[PDB]
Structure 1
């Protein structure tokens, strides 16, 4: 049973090296159910906010990707009303070499750099392409309303 072992080893590695940009841990005693917090990157409309995410590890992890979703609402082109994320490594580009730490780093980078090419919400991607001040302002609004 590689899943439990690797999840424990990953939690140990996160204890030894804490990433300032995010922090995660098992919600209770279900090692296959974690809760993560991603901090808003500086000089970004999400600055100052703290976004919570739920993570479910499959039983044959790391061979299948974890289910990651946003519980805190966020105004982002690639993130849904219910909170799903259009990230390749969670769907098509999953690899057994990826850790939950690398997944949270990829999510932080997607927050820093949204992907307009294939968006989960077309309206926000259009705003980003056309009106960036409106995009930054609406994301600031949403961060003040929900992330705080």
Structure 2
């Protein structure tokens, strides 16, 4: 576990992550804090979102537990920060790095999927009244994702 985690950390260090920044907390290798920048072409533009990543003992043979910390108004992210991503529950394989997980999360932010929602009310607002969803997302990202 330690070897794989350090290899991923070094790979992140060598290659510029640009719109992401993941690293261990304190000196603990099984607890990372990551930052995601809201896409410009999205309601979350100009926002910084903090994520907590917990690597299990069986890593990379079990998926990391990735949870949002900054509150976000998204159809696939609930109030506990849980993310509806298939690669984190049952599609995880011991060949996916944290960089690909962060890219998947950024793609999820860039376009939600209301056909299989995790928060039905937000999905209903998105499908019915798009402008109100846009306003709510902008207000939430200005109220929580900026600071």
The TM-score bracket by the shorter chain reads over 0.9
Which of 72, 76, 83 is 1:85 aligned to? Answer: 83
Which blocks of at least 5 consecutive residues in structure 1 are unaligned?
none
Mapped partners of 1:115, 1:96: distance in 2: 26
Residue 125 of structure 2 corresponds to 127
Can you list the C-alpha shifts for 1:10-53, whole angstroms capped at 9, x where unaligned?
A: 11011111221211100111101000000000121100000000
Q: Tell me if the contact between 2:9 and 2:23 (Cα under 8 Å) persists in the aligned partners.
A: yes
Residue aligned with 1:144, SS: helix
Matched, 1:17 2:15: yes
Bigger shift: residues 67-76 or 90-99: 90-99
Structure 1 runs (4+) deviating above 3 angstroms are none
Residue 64 of structure 1 corresponds to 62
Alignment of 1:35-50 (within 5 A): 35-50=33-48
Q: How many corresponding residue pairs? A: 146
Bigger shift: residues 131-140 or 47-56: 131-140
Which of 99, 102, 105 is 1:104 aligned to? Answer: 102
Query: How far off its partner does 1:59 sit?
Result: 1.1
Residue aligned with 1:32, SS: strand
Residue 146 of structure 1 corresponds to 144
Which of 89, 92, 95 is 2:93 aligned to? Answer: 95
